[PDB]
């Protein structure tokens, strides 16, 4: 049981806390005397249950939980996939190819190029850029239930930071094991955010909608809107940067309406430590806190879009 | 509660006020000369308004874990005053009470001979069946005096009321000593004296009825 | 030029309502922020609260349920009210103009900032003492001149309560050589001051020396002439 | 660790601990190292 309270700050009532200062009992190395230690959890990681206000971990009622070892890192490194003896891997070398059909210029390789396993949603990060004009790929364009993978030609500079100098408290749940809690925050209580240059994004979106008209009519209106709803991993730009798991609001990126014919865009990013990626139940991972402000610059190289069924099909 | 910092003239003075920094601060400093109203010296950590020399500098409000420090280069006798701070921390509520001040002592003042003056009871009060001898002491440094009244050569036990030293925009501390007597007591003895003991010297002024 | 003048009772009985007034000359009360600052003897200044037009007015959490502020746009002045005063409220109340500032540390849009206030133009200030004792009119007595080519001359303010007493010479036509000494708290509970002037012995004149004594708590203004 | 005098196991503050099964023995037995075909 976690007896939490608001983090030390000065109002307003719209800050809706987000960061909670939790105190609880804990088992030491010995199997006797207890331990009154405190931590600092995000709002998405805890959940109250009904004297003070009482919380609990959001996964305690779903599955077990394991802490990531601080020795390993979540840095996506290039991995070449190769074929055994007697087999071969064919590579399509045309500059325009939607992924399906016969390929004019085919070459064979033993090992593919360096593909970094970047786990992300909505925004494809650090991928291979397409050739000449941007490509639009889909298993079934007529089906509004099949996703639409987009590939970019020019990379979109994205800047993400974690404006919170966190402190790593290493409480000892011995013998052997050790939990890495979040101590007090050095500085101001700010939230993570990601910046995208309005100039780069305007050109990228206009190059995609001009390619979308090659499939939805030459003179048609294409409108962009944010996600419909559901899990947090589907409605937000989920990614990893510096060990932490960001969840950014992409309502400022998909707010436009294009007809047939100088600063940065800041996006609200939340951070969750206890995750259950890949629709996996039974294995919950606690990402250990990371000391210091985390900064990362990535390349926006593609999108994963879905189309609505409301139609009114030949109009917009 | 009170703190003191003595710095030789022309040197550099540094003053600590307020709690330890927890977040981004906006320390507002004020200087209060004795007997007057507080004046603005440095607002927003290290921003001086019109009229403030560059000798007064403050620590930037971007360092986490340090106390507010006021640096005064080229210390002069005119800088001898009290200094308060207004802590503006982004994690702490608005402090409606300034931090505890620190008093600046400009050394090598150094000494000042007291200018004593003894006035006899007025012609007007004796008529009100009242009498009072006044001993004014000024222009003396430091502020630490002891007054002893005398009737001829015999000390006066009761009726002595003495103020406490109080500096006045100078090295001049102020002190007035009163002796309430009766019109019969005044014309009784031959003369009264005002023995002032300051530091190591002792000035004596007398008075005789007419 | 901006001139501020404070004026109050000076003595307020316990469990009463203190009322003060800051007469403002030089600026309008609608175009500025206005703050009140209190200070006990030998303690650090305590911020009372800031008042402004359009309803922007906040108080001291420590004095929330006792203080009331107001702005008179017709009479061009600032008012103050303090209900239920005690001995801890005995201090020197100041009225000062207030300029606001905004410190940005975050991304602005996320309200990652805070507003700080600072007073630049203060006033002379008024003295407020809380005591259940009555007010006494002073009895002023003249100090006769006696002695180098120089001579001493002064006045005497005997038995008064409470502080302070403003003493001027020749209706303010003599500010050179005047040294006014701090009062003394008698055992009876009454104050008593003195003021001397260093003047040249050549005063046959008669160069009429009349000291002006003023006592706001007893509304007593006494002009005394010293003659050898 | 600081009524009687109180102790603890010396490893409880260092790492976990496992008991050796009484079935196995720590008797060093001769082991011949061999090389595969072609070596
Ligand atoms: C994603 O995208 C978003 C949005 O685009 C972006 O969000 C942005 O984040 C940044 C940082 O994260 C944030 O920056 C902050 O900005 C604060 C305000 O700066 C702006 O205003 C000032 C002043 O304007 C006022 O005054 C004017 C009159 O002078 C008046 O007209 C105005 O109306 C207003 O009242 C202005 O000077 C700034 O201009 C800077 O930027 C220009 C480029 O745009 C550049 O050309 C300028 O030169 C200037 O850059 C610096 O220039 C000199 C060096 O040449 C420096 O000396 C200056 O100080 C400038 O920094 C802006 O327009 C700013 O105050 C913040 O910096 C203070 O706070 C931090 C944190 O506490 C401290 O670490 C800093 O040291 C600094 O603290 C000093 O200043 C404060 C306030 O005055 C004092 O109280 C302090 O005591 C301290 O001053 C003392 O210490 C220093 C120590 O060296 C000393 O030098 C001083 O002399 C003094 O003794 C902070 O930088 C920005 O607001 C925010 N939003 C936007 C829209 O940009 C994200 O970052 C993006 N994310 C990513 C990953 O990309
Ligand atoms: C989340 O919530 C927890 C509470 O569970 C907070 O942790 C507490 O933080 C407070 C700080 O506000 C701590 O209180 C401080 O304790 C210090 C410990 O005292 C040491 O020194 C004395 C000698 O002076 C020893 O006798 C003693 O044994 C200790 O070794 C005090 O020194 C501090 O005093 C300072 O602050 C006060 C404030 O009024 C001043 O008046 C003092 O003059 C002095 O400057 C202070 O009292 C408290 O100990 C913490 N508890 C625990 C269990 O850690 C987290 O800070 C909070 N975090 C967030 C982000 O909200
Ligand atoms: C600590 O947090 C508190 C939050 O409760 C904060 O006090 C609040 O300050 C804001 C302004 O900073 C106040 O909001 C005001 O509301 C009035 C209407 O009643 C408006 O007229 C005000 O507008 C002025 O101030 C703006 C500030 O940005 C100016 O930009 C603007 O041009 C106007 O001049 C203002 O919106 C709010 O009422 C208080 N809340 C309380 C309870 O007093 C405090 O400042 C924070 N302090 C620190 C150190 O963090
Ligand atoms: C995000 O996109 C940028 C481009 O906008 C990438 O920067 C580019 O990185 C490549 C290699 O990854 C650089 O190519 C190099 O060229 C030099 C030229 O001599 C050559 O010597 C090297 O062997 C290499 O081929 C390229 O120069 C560089 N762009 C610029 C302007 O310098 C960046 O790597 C991308 N980040 C990712 C994918 O994480
Ligand atoms: C994301 O961050 C990167 C770097 O972390 C940003 O690129 C940086 O852009 C600035 C311009 O705003 C470059 O600054 C200056 O450019 C001038 C040339 O005009 C030069 O004279 C200066 O010396 C300095 O270089 C800066 O160099 C550049 N950094 C790098 C590593 O290339 C990028 O703009 C950020 N994106 C967003 C959307 O905020
Ligand atoms: C941590 O455990 C201690 C027990 O040692 C809790 O203290 C007890 O709390 C209960 C109610 O929760 C009281 O009825 C007892 O009187 C307390 N003292 C004891 C049992 O000695 C403490 O509340 C726990 N803290 C948590 C759960 O945050
Ligand atoms: C485990 O706890 C979570 C959080 O309390 C439960 O998620 C809730 O599910 C209900 C479904 O009816 C929603 O209405 C709530 O909004 C959810 N809460 C949150 C915070 O998202 C989850 O159902 C629980 N699992 C169980 C009890 O098996
Ligand atoms: C991918 O591109 C190929 C072209 O190489 C498409 O195949 C043609 O599709 C059109 C209709 O979209 C037909 O009229 C042609 O007869 C097809 N040509 C051949 C050779 O099959 C293919 O449909 C595209 N796939 C998607 C999903 O758009
Ligand atoms: C993502 O951003 C949108 C828009 O910026 C947020 O929508 C706001 O929701 C609040 C209530 O929570 C409203 O008061 C605002 O008016 C909404 N904004 C707009 C422009 O309509 C949304 O809450 C953010 N978060 C998520 C998870 O979508
Ligand atoms: C999409 O962007 C538009 C602006 O291009 C936003 O429109 C705002 O609309 C409200 C009232 O409906 C106005 O008060 C704002 O001033 C408008 N914004 C601007 C910049 O002028 C619209 O809210 C945005 N949609 C979302 C979901 O964020
Ligand atoms: C975050 O806070 C830590 C301290 O809590 C900072 O670490 C200090 O760094 C300076 C120089 O960078 C060293 O001289 C100190 O010894 C460090 N302190 C400790 C306790 O090791 C750290 O620099 C802060 N992060 C940032 C980005 O400023
Ligand atoms: C675990 O406990 C042992 C025994 O108490 C600790 O070993 C001590 O290490 C210190 C190092 O400063 C030595 O001065 C002592 O002499 C050691 N004790 C003995 C009995 O050898 C060990 O450091 C502890 N490990 C921790 C606390 O992580
Ligand atoms: C925590 O902050 C939220 C912010 O709205 C507030 O509603 C709540 O009452 C606060 N609770 C505590 C214990 O501070
Ligand atoms: C694609 O979807 C349409 C309707 O949604 C369906 O008729 C068709 O069989 C699907 N498959 C194709 C076109 O290969
Ligand atoms: C970029 O977008 C702005 C509005 O955000 C618009 O005024 C401008 O026309 C766009 N650029 C181009 C090339 O159309
Ligand atoms: C759409 O019209 C453009 C000219 O504006 C043309 O270049 C393009 O080929 C057309 N696409 C079609 C007909 O699919
Ligand atoms: C303030 O000044 C006006 C004239 O300017 C005067 O009538 C008024 O009485 C003064 N206020 C007080 C409290 O005396």
mmCIF file with all atom_site columns, C-alpha atoms in Angstrom, chain A residues 60-135:
data_model
loop_
_atom_site.group_PDB
_atom_site.id
_atom_site.type_symbol
_atom_site.label_atom_id
_atom_site.label_alt_id
_atom_site.label_comp_id
_atom_site.label_asym_id
_atom_site.label_entity_id
_atom_site.label_seq_id
_atom_site.pdbx_PDB_ins_code
_atom_site.Cartn_x
_atom_site.Cartn_y
_atom_site.Cartn_z
_atom_site.occupancy
_atom_site.B_iso_or_equiv
_atom_site.pdbx_formal_charge
_atom_site.auth_seq_id
_atom_site.auth_comp_id
_atom_site.auth_asym_id
_atom_site.auth_atom_id
_atom_site.pdbx_PDB_model_num
ATOM 1  C CA . UNK A 1 60  ? -0.410 -5.464  -9.300  1.00 0.00 ? 60  UNK A CA 1
ATOM 2  C CA . UNK A 1 61  ? -3.940 -6.439  -10.340 1.00 0.00 ? 61  UNK A CA 1
ATOM 3  C CA . UNK A 1 62  ? -2.925 -7.552  -13.859 1.00 0.00 ? 62  UNK A CA 1
ATOM 4  C CA . UNK A 1 63  ? 0.315  -9.588  -13.848 1.00 0.00 ? 63  UNK A CA 1
ATOM 5  C CA . UNK A 1 64  ? 3.745  -9.999  -12.270 1.00 0.00 ? 64  UNK A CA 1
ATOM 6  C CA . UNK A 1 65  ? 6.444  -7.315  -12.635 1.00 0.00 ? 65  UNK A CA 1
ATOM 7  C CA . UNK A 1 66  ? 10.212 -7.368  -13.289 1.00 0.00 ? 66  UNK A CA 1
ATOM 8  C CA . UNK A 1 67  ? 12.790 -4.572  -13.102 1.00 0.00 ? 67  UNK A CA 1
ATOM 9  C CA . UNK A 1 68  ? 15.121 -4.078  -16.041 1.00 0.00 ? 68  UNK A CA 1
ATOM 10 C CA . UNK A 1 69  ? 18.751 -4.558  -15.089 1.00 0.00 ? 69  UNK A CA 1
ATOM 11 C CA . UNK A 1 70  ? 20.672 -1.255  -15.225 1.00 0.00 ? 70  UNK A CA 1
ATOM 12 C CA . UNK A 1 71  ? 23.582 -2.997  -16.967 1.00 0.00 ? 71  UNK A CA 1
ATOM 13 C CA . UNK A 1 72  ? 21.779 -3.519  -20.281 1.00 0.00 ? 72  UNK A CA 1
ATOM 14 C CA . UNK A 1 73  ? 20.706 -0.706  -22.586 1.00 0.00 ? 73  UNK A CA 1
ATOM 15 C CA . UNK A 1 74  ? 17.731 -0.214  -24.888 1.00 0.00 ? 74  UNK A CA 1
ATOM 16 C CA . UNK A 1 75  ? 19.813 1.326   -27.673 1.00 0.00 ? 75  UNK A CA 1
ATOM 17 C CA . UNK A 1 76  ? 18.609 -0.002  -31.070 1.00 0.00 ? 76  UNK A CA 1
ATOM 18 C CA . UNK A 1 77  ? 21.676 -1.334  -32.863 1.00 0.00 ? 77  UNK A CA 1
ATOM 19 C CA . UNK A 1 78  ? 21.907 -2.364  -36.563 1.00 0.00 ? 78  UNK A CA 1
ATOM 20 C CA . UNK A 1 79  ? 21.138 -6.066  -37.089 1.00 0.00 ? 79  UNK A CA 1
ATOM 21 C CA . UNK A 1 80  ? 21.811 -7.780  -40.432 1.00 0.00 ? 80  UNK A CA 1
ATOM 22 C CA . UNK A 1 81  ? 19.587 -10.775 -41.228 1.00 0.00 ? 81  UNK A CA 1
ATOM 23 C CA . UNK A 1 82  ? 21.344 -13.481 -43.235 1.00 0.00 ? 82  UNK A CA 1
ATOM 24 C CA . UNK A 1 83  ? 20.270 -16.735 -44.959 1.00 0.00 ? 83  UNK A CA 1
ATOM 25 C CA . UNK A 1 84  ? 21.959 -20.143 -44.435 1.00 0.00 ? 84  UNK A CA 1
ATOM 26 C CA . UNK A 1 85  ? 23.877 -22.103 -47.055 1.00 0.00 ? 85  UNK A CA 1
ATOM 27 C CA . UNK A 1 86  ? 21.795 -23.155 -50.023 1.00 0.00 ? 86  UNK A CA 1
ATOM 28 C CA . UNK A 1 87  ? 19.395 -20.231 -49.500 1.00 0.00 ? 87  UNK A CA 1
ATOM 29 C CA . UNK A 1 88  ? 19.554 -16.601 -50.624 1.00 0.00 ? 88  UNK A CA 1
ATOM 30 C CA . UNK A 1 89  ? 17.923 -13.224 -49.997 1.00 0.00 ? 89  UNK A CA 1
ATOM 31 C CA . UNK A 1 90  ? 16.672 -11.214 -52.980 1.00 0.00 ? 90  UNK A CA 1
ATOM 32 C CA . UNK A 1 91  ? 16.727 -7.395  -52.914 1.00 0.00 ? 91  UNK A CA 1
ATOM 33 C CA . UNK A 1 92  ? 14.489 -5.081  -54.968 1.00 0.00 ? 92  UNK A CA 1
ATOM 34 C CA . UNK A 1 93  ? 16.446 -2.165  -56.461 1.00 0.00 ? 93  UNK A CA 1
ATOM 35 C CA . UNK A 1 94  ? 13.754 -0.081  -58.142 1.00 0.00 ? 94  UNK A CA 1
ATOM 36 C CA . UNK A 1 95  ? 13.311 3.498   -57.015 1.00 0.00 ? 95  UNK A CA 1
ATOM 37 C CA . UNK A 1 96  ? 9.486  3.170   -57.168 1.00 0.00 ? 96  UNK A CA 1
ATOM 38 C CA . UNK A 1 97  ? 8.018  0.011   -55.586 1.00 0.00 ? 97  UNK A CA 1
ATOM 39 C CA . UNK A 1 98  ? 4.901  -0.408  -53.439 1.00 0.00 ? 98  UNK A CA 1
ATOM 40 C CA . UNK A 1 99  ? 6.090  -3.696  -51.920 1.00 0.00 ? 99  UNK A CA 1
ATOM 41 C CA . UNK A 1 100 ? 3.824  -5.943  -54.016 1.00 0.00 ? 100 UNK A CA 1
ATOM 42 C CA . UNK A 1 101 ? 4.339  -7.229  -57.541 1.00 0.00 ? 101 UNK A CA 1
ATOM 43 C CA . UNK A 1 102 ? 7.130  -8.027  -59.990 1.00 0.00 ? 102 UNK A CA 1
ATOM 44 C CA . UNK A 1 103 ? 10.454 -6.188  -59.539 1.00 0.00 ? 103 UNK A CA 1
ATOM 45 C CA . UNK A 1 104 ? 12.482 -5.083  -62.614 1.00 0.00 ? 104 UNK A CA 1
ATOM 46 C CA . UNK A 1 105 ? 15.969 -4.636  -61.056 1.00 0.00 ? 105 UNK A CA 1
ATOM 47 C CA . UNK A 1 106 ? 16.534 -7.507  -58.610 1.00 0.00 ? 106 UNK A CA 1
ATOM 48 C CA . UNK A 1 107 ? 19.829 -8.301  -56.889 1.00 0.00 ? 107 UNK A CA 1
ATOM 49 C CA . UNK A 1 108 ? 20.758 -11.018 -54.419 1.00 0.00 ? 108 UNK A CA 1
ATOM 50 C CA . UNK A 1 109 ? 22.517 -10.634 -51.085 1.00 0.00 ? 109 UNK A CA 1
ATOM 51 C CA . UNK A 1 110 ? 23.511 -12.936 -48.284 1.00 0.00 ? 110 UNK A CA 1
ATOM 52 C CA . UNK A 1 111 ? 22.838 -10.390 -45.511 1.00 0.00 ? 111 UNK A CA 1
ATOM 53 C CA . UNK A 1 112 ? 20.381 -7.501  -45.416 1.00 0.00 ? 112 UNK A CA 1
ATOM 54 C CA . UNK A 1 113 ? 21.362 -3.963  -44.512 1.00 0.00 ? 113 UNK A CA 1
ATOM 55 C CA . UNK A 1 114 ? 21.617 -2.830  -40.886 1.00 0.00 ? 114 UNK A CA 1
ATOM 56 C CA . UNK A 1 115 ? 18.040 -2.742  -39.561 1.00 0.00 ? 115 UNK A CA 1
ATOM 57 C CA . UNK A 1 116 ? 17.754 -1.202  -36.075 1.00 0.00 ? 116 UNK A CA 1
ATOM 58 C CA . UNK A 1 117 ? 14.829 -2.717  -34.082 1.00 0.00 ? 117 UNK A CA 1
ATOM 59 C CA . UNK A 1 118 ? 13.167 0.589   -33.138 1.00 0.00 ? 118 UNK A CA 1
ATOM 60 C CA . UNK A 1 119 ? 9.897  -0.132  -31.301 1.00 0.00 ? 119 UNK A CA 1
ATOM 61 C CA . UNK A 1 120 ? 7.544  2.822   -31.828 1.00 0.00 ? 120 UNK A CA 1
ATOM 62 C CA . UNK A 1 121 ? 3.959  3.742   -32.743 1.00 0.00 ? 121 UNK A CA 1
ATOM 63 C CA . UNK A 1 122 ? 2.336  6.307   -35.055 1.00 0.00 ? 122 UNK A CA 1
ATOM 64 C CA . UNK A 1 123 ? 5.689  7.874   -36.072 1.00 0.00 ? 123 UNK A CA 1
ATOM 65 C CA . UNK A 1 124 ? 8.287  5.660   -37.772 1.00 0.00 ? 124 UNK A CA 1
ATOM 66 C CA . UNK A 1 125 ? 11.692 6.713   -36.424 1.00 0.00 ? 125 UNK A CA 1
ATOM 67 C CA . UNK A 1 126 ? 15.211 6.132   -37.852 1.00 0.00 ? 126 UNK A CA 1
ATOM 68 C CA . UNK A 1 127 ? 14.171 4.076   -40.871 1.00 0.00 ? 127 UNK A CA 1
ATOM 69 C CA . UNK A 1 128 ? 15.415 3.907   -44.438 1.00 0.00 ? 128 UNK A CA 1
ATOM 70 C CA . UNK A 1 129 ? 14.263 6.855   -46.526 1.00 0.00 ? 129 UNK A CA 1
ATOM 71 C CA . UNK A 1 130 ? 12.472 6.227   -49.809 1.00 0.00 ? 130 UNK A CA 1
ATOM 72 C CA . UNK A 1 131 ? 13.736 7.265   -53.235 1.00 0.00 ? 131 UNK A CA 1
ATOM 73 C CA . UNK A 1 132 ? 12.672 10.320  -55.251 1.00 0.00 ? 132 UNK A CA 1
ATOM 74 C CA . UNK A 1 133 ? 9.012  10.924  -54.438 1.00 0.00 ? 133 UNK A CA 1
ATOM 75 C CA . UNK A 1 134 ? 7.563  9.583   -51.188 1.00 0.00 ? 134 UNK A CA 1
ATOM 76 C CA . UNK A 1 135 ? 5.898  6.165   -51.285 1.00 0.00 ? 135 UNK A CA 1
#
